Each structure stands twice: as C-alpha cells, then as structure tokens.
Design a protein around this ligand. Structure first.
Ligand code: GTP
Ligand code: MG
Lengths: 204, 232, 159, 123
RNA sequence: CUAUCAACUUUCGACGGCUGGGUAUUGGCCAGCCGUGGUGACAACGGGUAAGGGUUAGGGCUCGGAGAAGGAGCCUGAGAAACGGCUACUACAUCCAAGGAAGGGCAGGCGCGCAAAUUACCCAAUCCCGACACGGGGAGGUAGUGACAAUAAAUACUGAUACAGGGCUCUUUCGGGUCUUGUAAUUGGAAUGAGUACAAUUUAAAUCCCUUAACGAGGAACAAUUGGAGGGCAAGUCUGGUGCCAGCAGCCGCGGUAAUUCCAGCUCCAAUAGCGUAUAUUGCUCGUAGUU
RNA sequence: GUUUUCAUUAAUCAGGAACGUAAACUAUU
C-alpha cells in the first residue's frame, strides 16, 4: 500500500498548470547569461567557455556570443555589465543563468538584487551558481566552511539543492579546463525551457 | 593474490599486513607447505620493514638459502632449509611446533653445514644409473644401495654428497608434517599396511598419547638421535 | 500529563540538566538495568545463572558507585533510581565536592575546561564518575584556579 | 563464560589485576571510556606500532563501518567504565558449563541405666 | 517439491564387444562389423524455478553458466575455440577531390516544464607483471558532501548596593491559605570557546587528530528556533439595532520616512538545535459422498 | 409385555429421491 502512497505522491509532484509551449522545430539559441558583482571575472568565464566550445582564444569578447553545443540545440552567452539597466533587461529575457559569487568575500548586493529581480519577473529555465576566487584561501578548513555556508544561503535564496560549482585557480588567465569541462557537461544536455507566459505571448 | 586470512595460518601475519598477502613463487616446496623469503625476513625476523627494503637486501648477495645465493623475493623455503645470513653470520632452520606453526631456530656453522631431507623416491636414471629424489626436489645420482622410499638422508650441502641415512623403523622417533595431528614429535610404534592405498602408522609421543598419521605425512627425524637441534 | 511534567522538571531543576532529552536518556538506561534485574529475579535462587549474573551486575553497580556497598541485593537493584544516577553524574559531583558555588557554575566550569578527572581534562558534564575515580576531581593545571597563566580578563586588566 | 572468567580473576585467583591510572582510560575529553577489552586492543595496537615502528593509518571506512554494524547488532552497553551485557546466550553458556562440570558403648549405657533403679517414684 | 508425470531410451548410439581414426591420453568420442539392449514404483522419466561449502562457545571469516553488431571458418601460444586479431556473408555508420578508405565498447546527464552525495589525489604502504634493484598497474588507500539517522553539548557564571511591598495559590470565590519577593534600578567581579591564527607536526602532497605563541563578550550583541493559547489599542474602517449597545475585526490614523522611540522589547504553555502540517493509519422424510 | 432372536448392523447430512387467494399484534432442569 505504501508503494501506492509513494506513487501517488510522486504523481502529485509531477503535475503542473498547462501552459502553452510555442517552441519551433528550428529552435533559437537558448540564452545563457553570466551575472555577477563587478570584478569577479564574468568576462574571463565567457572567454574560457567559448574556448572550451569553439577553441578560439577571444582577446576581448563583447556582446552576445553564439555557440553550437549539440547537433540539435545551440546556446548563446551574454555577460551582464555592471549596470542595473542591463541587469533588468537581461534578467527578464534570460533562460539559463550563471550566477557568479566572489568566494571568500561572500554574497553581494548585486547577486541578491539579481536573484530577486529574476524571481519576480520570471523564474527561468535553469539557474546555476558558480563560485570563484577559491585560490584566495589560506586554510582549507575556512575554504570548506565558506563553501558550506554559501551553499546553504544560496539554497535558501533560490531552492533546496541547486547546482553550485567551484572554480579554484586562474591557470593561463583562462580557468581550470577540467573544472569548466564538468560545468559544460552540466549545461550541455538540456531540456525544453520553462514556458513562461510573457515570453510565449510576446516576440523578442 | 589471495587475502591475508586465506593465506595459510602457519606462516603468521598480524592484523596489520594489509588485506593482501604474497603468494609463494614456484620452487622446490609445495604451495601450502612454504614460507616465502620476504615473509621470513620482514614478518618473522623483522630484519627489514618494507617490500622495497627486502628487495634491496635480496638484490645484494646477502641471503643464502641451502648454501646458494637466492635473488628473487618470493623464493619458497618450506621445511628444514638452512638460511645462512653472513652479515649476522647466523643460520636459521625451519621446524614446526606442537601447535603446527613455522618456528625459526638459530644455529652456528657446525650443525648448519648439513641438511636432513626425507627421500621421496628412487629410480634408475638415464644411462642405467640409480638416482634418488628427496622432498627438497633434490636429485642425488649414485646413492647408497640401501636407501629405499621414506628413508631420511643427512646431506653435506657443500658437495651434495650422501653423508648418512636413517631408516624407517618401528621403534624410531618421528615428526609429523601433515594431517590433523600435524607437528607432534613422537615415536613410531606401529605400522599398518592396508594394501590398496593409504597405509597408516600408529605413533605415540614420549608421554602416552596414541594417534594415527599417514606415512606420506610422516617425516623421520631420528630414533633417539635428534640430528637437528630442536628448540628447548 | 502534569505528573510526568512536574517530575521531570523537579529532576531538571534540582540537578540542572539541559533538557528532558537528557532526562529520558537516564531513564532509558535505568529501565534497561532494572529489566535485567527483573529477569534475574524471574529465575530462582541458587541457580548458577542467576547467581553469577546477579553477582556480576551488583558488582558493576557498586564499582560505578550507584548502589550502596551495604545493600547488595537484587530487590535494591530494582529499587535503583534515576535520582541515584543523577547524583552520580559529574556535574552534580563538582557541585557536591564544593569546587563550584552552584550547579550551573559546575556546568559552565566543565564546559570551559577547568576541572579534570584524574589526569586528562574532561569536556562533557554527563560523564559517569566511578566511585574509584570520584576522589580525583580537581582543577586542571592550565586553569587559572589551579595555576598557569592569570587568565584572559586578568591579562586585559593588567595591560 | 565472560562473567565466569571475570569472577575467577576477581574473587578466586590469588594475583592482583593491573588497574590503570584514573586519568588514562579517557578517550576524547570524557566522551567515552575505554573498557578493558578496547584498552587491551589499544595496547596491542601500540605494541604493533613499536614492533617495526611503522605508522598505522587511522581506521578506514570499511573497518569503521564493520565495528559500527557490530555495535548496532550487539546487546552490550557502556554505561560507565564497565560493560553491561544482555542476558541471553552468555547466561545460557554459564548454565551449560555449570551443568557440564556438575556431571560398643550404648550397650554399656543401657546396662548401667537398667542396673540403676528409680530415684523419684513420681513426686 | 510433485504421479493432473508410468512408462522412458533406441527420433544425434540406446547397452556391449572387436577393429581402426582423431585426441595429450582413456572413452560410442567418432567410422565400419555383429550381438540385444539399458532405466523404472527402492521412484526412471517428466514438470515446477523460488540456483550452498568449510572454518564449530557465538557471530564473524573464507570459498563458490553464456557473450563481447550476428551466424560460419581460421591464426599465436605451456595454457584460449582469446573476441585479441583476420577471411566471406548479413545489419549499421563515417571521410572523399566520387576513382576509393578505415570502423563497431563502457562510464555521465535528461528521461515532466520543477531540481538535491565528487567529472577529487596518489601508487605513499599490501600485492602483481616484465631483459629487469630503477619500468608499469582501474585492486588499494587518502580526500570532499550529509539534520536520513545516531552520538556529545555551547548561546553565559557569580557578587555587592539602592529602591519598592506585594508575590503566589484554591475545594467552596464579593470567600480562604502562605510569607520574603521584584526592578527597562546602580555598579563590581572573574571564566572564557566558536572564530581569527604565527608555527611545528601529520602525510606521496595535503587535510583531520595531537601539540600551540598571539588575539578573541556587554546585549544596539559572537544576533535559537518551531508551534499553541490569551490579553491591551485609534479623531480608522465595516455590520446589526425600539439613543451610549453588541459583533466582526483592526500593519490602514490628522501630519510626518531622518519622522517616530512607541505594550519598548505583551503574557502563558510545550519541544528545544530541533520542530510543525496533511493523509494512510496502528414444507417434511429417506438417502449418497463427507463426518463422528 | 415376553421365559424372543443377529450383534454393529449406528448417528448425521453434499448430490439426489417420495410426498404439497394469502398475511395483518405477536445430560438434567
Ligand atoms: N586568483 C584569482 N583571480 C581571479 C579569479 N577570478 C577573477 N580573477 C581576476 O580578477 C579579474 C576579474 O576580471 P573579470 O572577470 O574580467 O571582471 P568582469 O566583470 O568579467 O569584467 P569587468 O567589467 O572588466 O570587471 C580577472 O582579470 C582575473 O585576473 C579567481 O578565481 N582567482
Ligand atoms: Mg563582461
């Protein structure tokens, strides 16, 4: 009987509200935005992502950058500059978000501001926390304590059990290629975006 | 690559030699009836610590078994093989005890010069010459013509010459090398033929305890004459 | 129920434990020992099982100091009480030996590492002090009551 | 036979038992207390450490989980310094072991009384 | 385990003996020749698929068929019908200058549009393989996460002074009982571990553990939670009605946001680093088989 | 009732067989 209770509770977790999809068979590139406080290296993460993806050493990558990642779907990266106008625009347009956190320095008003703006306008498809500046630690006890309390505060911010990756060093001015490889492993195989009513009623 | 517990329980390893245990290499003695040289050095004697240390010691010509230098790490040395170490100048011999475990004994050169080996069998070799097979897998050409199966031979170990022999005899003292009563030094009192396989001897101790061991496991040491220095 | 509530509160206050969780823990081990004594009384007298097991149990209880050395019978092993276990607790033993002014003073002393049991210091106050170990409870050698440095606030006042 | 053995060593055999000093059987600032068995095990472990003076790795996940499942399955408890055991197959072993180890003058007096007569007929 | 399995084998020879072939060797294992069998109610044969041994006080411990896209054939080697290779067919897939060429496994993520344990480090020890002390090891250990549990226990300890006279309780209530209780009062003491951290140690390198110098407590903080019960309020709002009553309630009031210091932190209950909620729940007579 | 016999022949009922306008106060004791 308890198997029936578990099955019923899983199905009652499975249900939703039936919203309209409106996605074409030739899907546009999904929007990956990179949002963080000033001086955390969202441009450097953009450089290292596009190098893992298309093997091109961009010296100064600006504006949207389109990359093909599967034979079926393709992404495009946009770093947000440090102005709240760009933050609100890209927040209301985003689909998957890489939220950068400056490690030892802890959370920042830019991060919490963007998180609340995002959740108020519309909770996008995927959000991942990336945590940098972990070479700037002297005791690994302090390192793992900061990692644990930042993961907990971030979970309480968005939801229980979000993905939070950690990027340790700055090797070639690029990133650890293994670190960004598992990051790209997470953001490669993708699902259809969450069908929000504003993006599915207006053309952008 | 067996586990430490599945290794035979009479060459001892404590609870800290890891989950593994070495297997003996191929050689004269049998697999179950062997003590490998690394276990003899670093587990029983503790003249070293590590596998690499034992590798270095065995690599330089420093450990001699049965009068010959042995190079490799896991050379088997099962039973009554003298182990001369010259930098300490000691000689070690492997006997059992009453419980049935390997026991090491210290000896000088006079008793270390010779070995006592049980005769496995005897035949005629190529050329029409009688040859003699010990349990040490040693073959002696041109033996004494009285040395039958299950005899014992005192061996020179320097020229391999047959120095002496001891006869299988009721009324002789023996040592057991197998069976459920393994390692019980006592006197042979009776032999039972049972023609058709697995003849038995009845062997009592020096102190009134009778038991039945088989001839294959029986290992004649001497009538009284304990030609090797048993530990006191 | 009000009876269980006021009883647990009386135990807590007169021996200033932290919570009824600790109270229920002592009640649980008391119940297990009392049950073992009950089974041994279910056996009959002069049976070797009851004789040896009951003698062992009484010797353990005496050697940890709960049962008095006068009475050594299984009826009194049944009459053993959680009040007796809490009297054997370490915190109440500091307060009774008189190193502390109050039971909570004993609790905070044991927390911030001033007393020792024998040779090593003791950080926990739910320690069950044995009768052989009771006499050696004193201030540690690194505590400002025992010696060592004059301490933190004394340092800041001397500066 | 454990209670039997402790009984022989404590009330029978004429030899003092080695009691450790009071502040040495404390593991981690009073969190637990080393019983006699774990104490002897620690001493054997330290003797192995000094035998060939090689350091030992502090216990791994396998052996730790094994002793954890053994304490989860066992019927012992460490209330104070002494160990308490359940009352089953140990007591039955005590019973089995105890059963197995259990497996010419009155003529002269009468003549003297008969020869002597009464002194008081009946008051 | 079963007769809702009593006949089975000779339907790939079933039982022999003789003769050879092949195999490392014996052998109906196979080819000739002839003989007549062999198994079974003491349970053959069939059917069901739910596929233990040793080490003995105990538990523990140890040991235990078919295939590498699919048939078929071949090759080396002490040991393989290796799936390692090749050969042809079939089924796929890739590059191209359209003449041609090479190739097939496991691990990870999603599997709703909504979710939760690393893509970690080294052969350092035990062990294995080599021309060989030195080379190489996907067993092995080291590390990281966890409120699913389970274990231990911080968030404060103790004085002095001044002032107020009530604090509490009940069966029986315009009624009883008991006597030291408080304060957003004023000052004094000491103790320190979370944390910060020079080092040294640990170790393959690190961490953890043990050592350990120096810092590190006054509430407006080094900032305890989750539920339940209950009181007090306006120049406010709403609703009922034989004036002022009653009820629902009440962040919302005239102004004022650098303005206010207000019940200044309302009171009580329970668990307390845990706790709460939902749901499931805990006509009569004879007569056969059958029965006594 | 007998100054009558046979000595378990017995009991029970699956299955089965023979007989066929209404209701409306209610081991003993
Ligand atoms: N050691 C260390 N340095 C980092 C790390 N991340 C970023 N940096 C340095 O910090 C700088 C941050 O630069 P960006 O990441 O480009 O800043 P941005 O927001 O992306 O672009 P800007 O608008 O120019 O600030 C980089 O140039 C790096 O040199 C890190 O994780 N570790
Ligand atoms: Mg940028």
């Amino acid at each position: 009987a308890r198997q029936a209770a578990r099955s019923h509770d899983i199905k009652e977790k499975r249900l939703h509200v039936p919203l309209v999809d409106r996605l074409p068979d030739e899907p546009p590139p999904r929007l990956v935005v990179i949002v963080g406080p000033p001086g955390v290296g969202k441009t450097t993460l953009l450089k290292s992502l596009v190098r893992r993806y298309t093997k091109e050493t961009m010296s100064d990558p600006v504006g949207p950058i389109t990359v093909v990642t599967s034979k079926k779907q393709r992404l495009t990266f946009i770093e947000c500059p440090n102005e709240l106008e760009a933050m609100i625009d890209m927040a209301k347009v985003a689909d998957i978000v890489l939220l950068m956190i400056d490690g030892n320095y802890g959370f920042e008003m830019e991060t919490m501001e963007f998180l609340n703006i995002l959740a108020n306008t519309g909770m996008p498809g995927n959000v991942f926390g990336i945590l940098t500046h972990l070479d700037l630690f002297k005791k690994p006890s302090a390192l793992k304590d900061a990692k644990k309390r930042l993961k907990h505060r971030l979970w309480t911010e968005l939801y229980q059990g979000a993905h939070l990756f950690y990027l340790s060093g700055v090797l070639n001015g690029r990133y650890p290629d293994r670190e960004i490889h598992n990051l790209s492993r997470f953001l490669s195989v993708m699902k259809n975006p969450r069908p929000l009513v504003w993006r599915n009623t207006h053309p952008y | 690559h067996q586990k430490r517990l599945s290794a035979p329980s009479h060459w001892l390893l404590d609870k800290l030699s890891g989950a593994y245990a070495p297997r003996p290499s191929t050689g004269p003695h049998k697999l179950r009836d062997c003590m490998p040289l690394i276990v003899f050095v670093r587990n029983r004697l503790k003249y070293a610590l590590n596998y690499r240390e034992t590798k270095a010691i065995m690599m330089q010509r420093l450990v001699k078994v049965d009068g010959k230098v042995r190079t490799d790490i896991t050379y088997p040395a099962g039973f009554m093989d003298v182990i001369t170490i010259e930098k300490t100048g000691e000689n070690f011999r492997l006997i059992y005890d009453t419980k049935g475990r390997f026991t090491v004994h210290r000896i000088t050169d006079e008793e270390a010069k010779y070995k006592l080996g049980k005769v496995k069998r005897v035949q005629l070799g190529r050329g029409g010459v009688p040859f003699l097979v010990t349990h040490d897998a040693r073959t002696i050409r041109y033996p004494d013509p009285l040395i039958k199966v299950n005899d014992t031979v005192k061996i020179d170990l320097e020229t391999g010459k047959i120095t002496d022999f001891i006869k299988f005899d009721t009324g002789a003292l023996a040592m057991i090398t197998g069976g459920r009563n393994m390692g019980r030094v006592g006197v042979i009192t009776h032999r039972e033929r049972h023609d058709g396989g697995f003849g038995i001897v009845h062997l009592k101790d020096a102190l009134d305890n009778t038991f039945a061991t088989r001839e294959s496991n029986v290992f004649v040491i001497g009538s009284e004459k304990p030609w090797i220095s048993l530990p006191k | 129920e009000a009876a269980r509530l006021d009883s647990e509160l009386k135990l807590v206050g007169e021996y200033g434990l932290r919570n009824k969780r600790e109270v229920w823990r002592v009640l649980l081990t008391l119940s297990k020992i009392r049950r073992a004594a009950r089974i041994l009384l279910t056996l009959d007298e002069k049976d070797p099982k009851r004789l040896f097991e009951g003698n062992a149990l009484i010797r353990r209880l005496v050697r940890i100091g709960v049962l008095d050395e006068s009475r050594m019978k299984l009826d009194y092993v049944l009459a053993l009480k959680a009040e007796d276990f809490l009297e054997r607790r370490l915190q109440t033993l500091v307060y009774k030996l008189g190193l502390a002014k109050s039971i909570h003073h004993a609790r905070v002393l044991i927390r911030q590492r001033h007393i020792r049991v024998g040779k090593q210091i003791v950080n926990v106050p739910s320690f069950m002090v044995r009768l052989d170990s009771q006499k050696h409870i004193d201030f540690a050698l690194t505590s400002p009551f025992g010696g060592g440095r004059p301490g933190r606030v004394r340092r800041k006042k001397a500066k | 036979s454990a209670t039997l053995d402790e009984f022989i060593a404590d009330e029978v055999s004429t030899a003092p038992i080695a009691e450790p000093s009071i502040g040495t059987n404390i593991v981690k600032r009073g969190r637990g207390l080393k019983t006699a068995a774990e104490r002897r095990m620690e001493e054997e472990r330290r003797e192995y450490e000094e035998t060939n003076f090689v350091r030992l790795p502090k216990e791994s996940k396998k052996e730790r989980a094994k002793r954890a499942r053994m304490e989860g399955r066992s019927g012992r408890m460490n209330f104070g310094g002494e160990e308490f055991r359940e009352l089953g197959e140990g007591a039955e072993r005590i019973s089995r072991l105890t059963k197995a180890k259990s497996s010419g003058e009155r003529y002269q007096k009468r003549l003297k009384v008969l020869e002597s007569g009464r002194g008081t007929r009946g008051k």
